[PDB]
Amino acid sequence: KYQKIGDVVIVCKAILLYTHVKILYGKETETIHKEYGCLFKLDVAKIMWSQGNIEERKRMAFISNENEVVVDMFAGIGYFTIPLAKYSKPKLVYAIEKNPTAYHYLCENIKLNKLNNVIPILADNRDVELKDVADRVIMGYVHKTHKFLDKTFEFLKDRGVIHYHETVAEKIMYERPIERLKFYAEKNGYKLIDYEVRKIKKYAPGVWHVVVDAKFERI
Ligand SMILES: C[S@@+](CC[C@H](N)C(=O)[O-])C[C@H]1O[C@@H](n2cnc3c(N)ncnc32)[C@H](O)[C@@H]1O
DSSP states (O other): OOEEETTEEEOOOSEEEEOOOEEEEOSOOEEEEEETTEEEEEETTTSOOOGGGHHHHHHHHTSOOTTOEEEETTOTTTTTHHHHHHHTOOSEEEEEEOOHHHHHHHHHHHHHTTOSSEEEEESOGGGOOOTTOEEEEEEOOOSSGGGGHHHHHHHEEEEEEEEEEEEEEGGGTTTHHHHHHHHHHHHTTEEEEEEEEEEEEEEETTEEEEEEEEEEEEO
Protein backbone atom coordinates (compact mmCIF):
# COMPACT_ATOMS: atom_id res chain seq x y z
CA LYS A 1 0.00 0.00 0.00
CA TYR A 2 1.22 3.53 0.76
CA GLN A 3 1.65 5.39 4.05
CA LYS A 4 0.40 8.98 4.00
CA ILE A 5 2.31 10.79 6.75
CA GLY A 6 1.34 14.45 7.06
CA ASP A 7 1.60 15.91 3.56
CA VAL A 8 4.10 13.21 2.61
CA VAL A 9 3.38 9.89 0.89
CA ILE A 10 5.69 6.91 1.34
CA VAL A 11 5.61 4.48 -1.59
CA CYS A 12 -2.04 14.70 -4.19
CA LYS A 13 0.21 15.79 -1.33
CA ALA A 14 3.37 17.82 -0.73
CA ILE A 15 5.90 15.17 -1.78
CA LEU A 16 6.49 11.41 -1.74
CA LEU A 17 9.41 9.13 -0.82
CA TYR A 18 10.68 5.63 -1.57
CA THR A 19 12.07 3.50 1.26
CA HIS A 20 17.73 4.45 2.81
CA VAL A 21 15.36 7.09 1.44
CA LYS A 22 14.97 8.33 -2.13
CA ILE A 23 12.93 11.37 -3.16
CA LEU A 24 10.51 10.91 -6.05
CA TYR A 25 8.92 14.37 -6.08
CA GLY A 26 10.00 17.54 -4.30
CA LYS A 27 12.48 18.51 -1.62
CA GLU A 28 10.77 18.70 1.78
CA THR A 29 10.49 15.56 3.95
CA GLU A 30 9.44 17.31 7.15
CA THR A 31 5.72 17.29 8.07
CA ILE A 32 3.21 17.45 10.88
CA HIS A 33 1.23 14.26 11.37
CA LYS A 34 -2.13 14.22 13.14
CA GLU A 35 -3.30 11.09 14.95
CA TYR A 36 -6.13 10.82 17.45
CA GLY A 37 -6.09 14.50 18.37
CA CYS A 38 -2.30 14.64 18.57
CA LEU A 39 0.16 16.47 16.34
CA PHE A 40 3.52 14.90 15.48
CA LYS A 41 6.08 16.89 13.58
CA LEU A 42 8.90 14.80 12.15
CA ASP A 43 11.26 14.44 9.22
CA VAL A 44 9.95 11.33 7.52
CA ALA A 45 13.31 10.87 5.80
CA LYS A 46 15.18 10.52 9.10
CA ILE A 47 12.48 9.46 11.56
CA MET A 48 10.38 6.34 11.05
CA TRP A 49 6.68 6.28 11.91
CA SER A 50 5.48 2.79 12.85
CA GLN A 51 2.07 1.69 11.58
CA GLY A 52 2.05 -1.47 13.67
CA ASN A 53 2.38 0.38 16.98
CA ILE A 54 -0.86 2.43 16.67
CA GLU A 55 -2.86 0.18 19.00
CA GLU A 56 -0.30 0.55 21.79
CA ARG A 57 -0.21 4.35 21.35
CA LYS A 58 -4.01 4.36 21.74
CA ARG A 59 -3.65 2.14 24.83
CA MET A 60 -1.04 4.42 26.45
CA ALA A 61 -3.28 7.45 25.92
CA PHE A 62 -5.53 6.64 28.89
CA ILE A 63 -3.25 4.34 30.90
CA SER A 64 -2.40 7.02 33.48
CA ASN A 65 -4.26 9.61 35.60
CA GLU A 66 -3.87 13.14 36.99
CA ASN A 67 -2.30 11.86 40.22
CA GLU A 68 0.68 10.26 38.46
CA VAL A 69 4.21 11.22 37.57
CA VAL A 70 5.31 9.21 34.55
CA VAL A 71 8.77 8.49 33.13
CA ASP A 72 9.00 7.58 29.44
CA MET A 73 12.47 6.06 29.00
CA PHE A 74 12.53 5.84 25.21
CA ALA A 75 10.36 8.78 24.19
CA GLY A 76 11.33 9.35 20.56
CA ILE A 77 9.27 12.18 19.05
CA GLY A 78 6.60 11.50 21.65
CA TYR A 79 4.66 8.50 20.32
CA PHE A 80 3.52 7.56 23.83
CA THR A 81 4.38 10.69 25.75
CA ILE A 82 2.14 13.03 23.76
CA PRO A 83 -1.14 11.05 23.87
CA LEU A 84 -0.53 10.02 27.48
CA ALA A 85 0.20 13.61 28.53
CA LYS A 86 -2.89 14.83 26.70
CA TYR A 87 -5.50 12.19 27.60
CA SER A 88 -4.29 10.94 31.01
CA LYS A 89 -3.19 14.43 32.13
CA PRO A 90 -0.64 13.18 34.68
CA LYS A 91 1.05 15.71 36.96
CA LEU A 92 4.26 15.31 35.00
CA VAL A 93 5.93 13.14 32.41
CA TYR A 94 9.69 12.96 32.04
CA ALA A 95 10.33 12.13 28.40
CA ILE A 96 13.86 10.86 27.87
CA GLU A 97 15.24 10.55 24.33
CA LYS A 98 18.90 9.95 23.44
CA ASN A 99 18.93 10.88 19.75
CA PRO A 100 19.32 14.66 19.16
CA THR A 101 17.24 14.69 15.98
CA ALA A 102 14.29 12.78 17.52
CA TYR A 103 14.71 14.97 20.60
CA HIS A 104 14.34 18.07 18.44
CA TYR A 105 10.92 16.84 17.33
CA LEU A 106 9.90 15.68 20.83
CA CYS A 107 10.53 19.30 21.77
CA GLU A 108 8.46 20.77 18.88
CA ASN A 109 5.67 18.29 19.59
CA ILE A 110 5.27 19.21 23.24
CA LYS A 111 4.90 22.82 22.09
CA LEU A 112 2.61 21.96 19.16
CA ASN A 113 0.28 20.04 21.46
CA LYS A 114 0.43 22.86 24.00
CA LEU A 115 1.40 20.52 26.84
CA ASN A 116 2.43 21.98 30.18
CA ASN A 117 3.03 18.70 31.99
CA VAL A 118 5.99 17.38 29.97
CA ILE A 119 9.72 17.80 30.60
CA PRO A 120 11.88 16.48 27.74
CA ILE A 121 15.38 15.24 28.59
CA LEU A 122 18.06 14.75 25.95
CA ALA A 123 20.12 11.85 27.24
CA ASP A 124 20.77 8.16 27.47
CA ASN A 125 18.20 7.19 30.10
CA ARG A 126 20.95 5.33 31.95
CA ASP A 127 22.59 8.69 32.63
CA VAL A 128 19.47 10.40 33.92
CA GLU A 129 19.19 10.74 37.70
CA LEU A 130 15.56 10.77 38.85
CA LYS A 131 15.33 8.83 42.12
CA ASP A 132 11.98 7.48 43.35
CA VAL A 133 9.78 9.89 41.37
CA ALA A 134 7.81 7.63 39.02
CA ASP A 135 4.39 6.09 39.60
CA ARG A 136 4.69 4.60 36.12
CA VAL A 137 7.58 3.89 33.74
CA ILE A 138 7.24 3.08 30.04
CA MET A 139 9.95 1.06 28.28
CA GLY A 140 8.94 1.10 24.60
CA TYR A 141 12.15 -0.47 23.25
CA VAL A 142 12.97 -4.00 22.09
CA HIS A 143 16.78 -4.16 22.18
CA LYS A 144 18.02 -5.85 25.36
CA THR A 145 15.41 -3.86 27.29
CA HIS A 146 16.07 -5.90 30.44
CA LYS A 147 19.51 -4.24 30.64
CA PHE A 148 17.70 -1.01 31.45
CA LEU A 149 15.59 -2.34 34.35
CA ASP A 150 18.19 -1.37 36.96
CA LYS A 151 17.49 2.23 35.96
CA THR A 152 13.73 1.87 35.74
CA PHE A 153 13.70 0.54 39.30
CA GLU A 154 15.63 3.64 40.38
CA PHE A 155 12.99 5.86 38.77
CA LEU A 156 10.13 3.96 40.41
CA LYS A 157 8.47 5.08 43.65
CA ASP A 158 7.96 2.73 46.62
CA ARG A 159 5.07 1.40 44.56
CA GLY A 160 4.44 1.65 40.82
CA VAL A 161 3.98 -0.05 37.46
CA ILE A 162 6.40 -0.72 34.60
CA HIS A 163 5.38 -1.20 30.98
CA TYR A 164 8.11 -3.53 29.79
CA HIS A 165 8.59 -4.39 26.11
CA GLU A 166 10.49 -7.38 24.77
CA THR A 167 10.64 -9.47 21.62
CA VAL A 168 10.39 -13.13 22.54
CA ALA A 169 9.88 -16.59 21.05
CA GLU A 170 6.24 -17.68 21.24
CA LYS A 171 7.04 -20.73 23.36
CA ILE A 172 8.30 -18.70 26.35
CA MET A 173 6.50 -15.41 25.74
CA TYR A 174 4.53 -15.73 29.00
CA GLU A 175 7.61 -16.89 30.89
CA ARG A 176 10.93 -15.20 30.03
CA PRO A 177 9.80 -11.55 30.30
CA ILE A 178 8.47 -12.36 33.77
CA GLU A 179 11.55 -14.12 35.11
CA ARG A 180 13.64 -11.18 33.86
CA LEU A 181 11.42 -8.70 35.70
CA LYS A 182 11.66 -10.78 38.90
CA PHE A 183 15.44 -11.05 38.65
CA TYR A 184 15.89 -7.28 38.34
CA ALA A 185 13.15 -6.52 40.86
CA GLU A 186 15.01 -8.53 43.52
CA LYS A 187 18.30 -7.05 42.38
CA ASN A 188 16.83 -3.61 43.11
CA GLY A 189 14.85 -4.34 46.27
CA TYR A 190 11.40 -4.63 44.69
CA LYS A 191 8.98 -7.53 44.33
CA LEU A 192 6.42 -8.37 41.63
CA ILE A 193 2.81 -7.95 42.78
CA ASP A 194 0.82 -8.74 39.65
CA TYR A 195 1.23 -8.55 35.91
CA GLU A 196 -0.40 -8.94 32.52
CA VAL A 197 1.19 -9.86 29.22
CA ARG A 198 -0.19 -8.43 25.96
CA LYS A 199 0.83 -9.09 22.35
CA ILE A 200 1.58 -6.06 20.20
CA LYS A 201 2.68 -7.49 16.86
CA LYS A 202 4.44 -10.42 15.24
CA TYR A 203 8.06 -9.23 15.20
CA ALA A 204 9.42 -12.11 13.14
CA PRO A 205 8.56 -15.72 12.25
CA GLY A 206 7.73 -17.30 15.62
CA VAL A 207 8.65 -14.21 17.63
CA TRP A 208 6.27 -11.78 19.33
CA HIS A 209 6.75 -8.19 20.43
CA VAL A 210 5.03 -8.17 23.82
CA VAL A 211 4.36 -5.64 26.54
CA VAL A 212 4.07 -6.61 30.15
CA ASP A 213 2.21 -4.40 32.58
CA ALA A 214 3.79 -5.16 35.95
CA LYS A 215 3.14 -3.70 39.40
CA PHE A 216 5.90 -3.60 42.01
CA GLU A 217 6.48 -2.48 45.57
CA ARG A 218 9.86 -2.38 47.27
CA ILE A 219 10.93 -4.93 49.91
C1 LIG B 1 11.18 6.16 18.79
S1 LIG B 1 10.87 4.77 19.91
C2 LIG B 1 10.14 3.57 18.75
C3 LIG B 1 8.67 3.31 19.07
C4 LIG B 1 7.81 2.75 17.93
N1 LIG B 1 8.61 2.49 16.74
C5 LIG B 1 6.62 3.66 17.62
O1 LIG B 1 6.48 4.16 16.50
O2 LIG B 1 5.75 3.91 18.46
C6 LIG B 1 12.56 4.22 20.29
C7 LIG B 1 13.45 5.43 20.63
O3 LIG B 1 14.25 5.23 21.78
C8 LIG B 1 15.47 5.95 21.63
N2 LIG B 1 16.51 5.35 22.50
C9 LIG B 1 17.27 4.25 22.23
N3 LIG B 1 18.09 4.02 23.28
C10 LIG B 1 17.85 4.96 24.23
C11 LIG B 1 18.40 5.18 25.48
N4 LIG B 1 19.36 4.37 25.94
N5 LIG B 1 17.96 6.23 26.24
C12 LIG B 1 16.96 7.08 25.76
N6 LIG B 1 16.42 6.85 24.51
C13 LIG B 1 16.86 5.81 23.75
C14 LIG B 1 15.79 5.87 20.15
O4 LIG B 1 16.52 6.99 19.72
C15 LIG B 1 14.41 5.84 19.52
O5 LIG B 1 14.08 7.16 19.14
